[PDB]
C-alpha cells in the first residue's frame, strides 16, 4: 500500500477549485482512487500599514494574504497516473508538490 | 561587562604600538584614535593621547585604573552649569 500526497496550494478559491476539478477528472479517467479535495484550514496573514507618511497614523487598515491549501491523498499510484500528472499542464496560479 | 570567555579586547595596531614602545623602553605620548581599547597591566607607565572629537587629550595611566576603558576618563561633553 503506497499513497502519494499531492499538495495543492494556491491563492484564489476559483483557481484552486479549478485545479482540483482538473485533477479529479484526470484521476477518474486514468482509473485511480482519490479521496478528493479534503478542505484544510486556510493560513491567514494580516499586515497593517499606515495611511500616509509624516504622521496621520490614527486611522489604519489591514491587508490579508489568502492562501488556500487542499489535501489529495491518491491511493494505488499507477505508473500511467503518475505520468499523466507529470504531463498535465496547469495554470501558473497553481503549484503542485509531489511527496 | 565583556564576557570572560571572550576575554579583554585590544586593537591590534595599538597593541603593536605599545609593544614596540615598552620593548624599546621609550615613553612618549601616543595619538590614540581608539575608544574601545581596554586597559592592560602593560599600560602601567604609558601615556596615551585619546581623541574626544576636538583634540587629542593626553592621559597618564597608572595601576589604579586597571579594569576600565580608555574613554571613561576622557569627558565627551562640556557642562559648565547654569
Amino acid at each position: 500500500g503506497q499513497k502519494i500526497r499531492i499538495r495543492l496550494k494556491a491563492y484564489d478559491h476559483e483557481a484552486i477549485d479549478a485545479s482540483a476539478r482538473k485533477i479529479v477528472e484526470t484521476v477518474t479517467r486514468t482509473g485511480a482512487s482519490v479521496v478528493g479535495p479534503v478542505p484544510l484550514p486556510t493560513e491567514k496573514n494580516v499586515y497593517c500599514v499606515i495611511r500616509s507618511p509624516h504622521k496621520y497614523k490614527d486611522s489604519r487598515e489591514h491587508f490579508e494574504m489568502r492562501t488556500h491549501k487542499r489535501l489529495i491523498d491518491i491511493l494505488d499510484p499507477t505508473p500511467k497516473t503518475v505520468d499523466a500528472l507529470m504531463r498535465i499542464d496547469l495554470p501558473a496560479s497553481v503549484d503542485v508538490n509531489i511527496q | 561587562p565583556r564576557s570572560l570567555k571572550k576575554g579583554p579586547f585590544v586593537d591590534d595596531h595599538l597593541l603593536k604600538k605599545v609593544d614596540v614602545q615598552n620593548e624599546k623602553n621609550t615613553k612618549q605620548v601616543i595619538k590614540t584614535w581608539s575608544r574601545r581599547s581596554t586597559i592592560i597591566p602593560d599600560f602601567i607607565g604609558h601615556t596615551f593621547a585619546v581623541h574626544d572629537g576636538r583634540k587629542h587629550v593626553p592621559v597618564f595611566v597608572t595601576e589604579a585604573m586597571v579594569g576600565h576603558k580608555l574613554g571613561e576618563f576622557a569627558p565627551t561633553r562640556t557642562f559648565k552649569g547654569h
Partner: protein, 126 residues
C-alpha cells in the same frame, strides 16, 4: 441513537440521552466534580426541572473549546434539544420558558485603532 450539539461563544458540546438513571457524565466525571459551581449546576438542571422528568435520563458529554460558562450553557441547550427530539410534546412550554432558543451572541470583531472589542483610546481635546 439520539444525538445533539450545542454551541455558544465557541463552546461545542456533545450529549447522548439514555432513559436510565439521572447520572451526569461530563468527560468521565460527575457534574459536581466538573465545574463545581452552584450557578452551573442550577442552569444545567433547569431544563429537566422545567420538564419535571428528573432522575430519568443519563447523559454523556464531550466538550471542546469555549469557557466554563460557555460549555455549561451549551450543554444546557444540548440536553434541552435532545429532550425535545425524544419528545416534541413539550414544545410549547419549553419554547415559552426559553430553553430551546439559542443565545446568538459571542465575541465580536474589534476595530483597528481600538484597544479591544469596543474600547476607545483616551480622547482629549488638549
Amino acid at each position: 441513537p439520539i444525538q445533539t450539539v450545542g454551541r455558544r461563544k465557541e463552546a461545542v458540546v456533545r450529549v447522548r440521552l439514555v432513559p436510565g438513571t439521572g447520572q451526569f457524565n461530563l468527560d468521565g466525571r460527575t457534574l459536581e466534580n466538573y465545574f463545581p459551581n452552584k450557578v452551573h449546576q442550577q442552569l444545567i438542571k433547569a431544563p429537566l426541572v422545567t420538564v419535571d422528568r428528573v432522575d430519568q435520563f443519563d447523559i454523556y458529554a464531550h466538550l471542546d473549546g469555549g469557557g466554563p460558562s460557555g460549555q455549561a450553557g451549551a450543554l444546557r441547550l444540548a440536553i434541552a434539544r435532545a429532550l425535545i427530539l425524544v419528545q416534541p410534546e413539550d414544545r410549547p412550554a419549553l419554547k415559552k420558558a426559553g430553553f430551546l432558543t439559542r443565545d446568538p451572541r459571542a465575541i465580536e470583531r474589534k476595530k483597528y485603532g481600538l484597544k479591544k472589542a469596543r474600547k476607545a483610546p483616551q480622547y482629549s481635546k488638549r
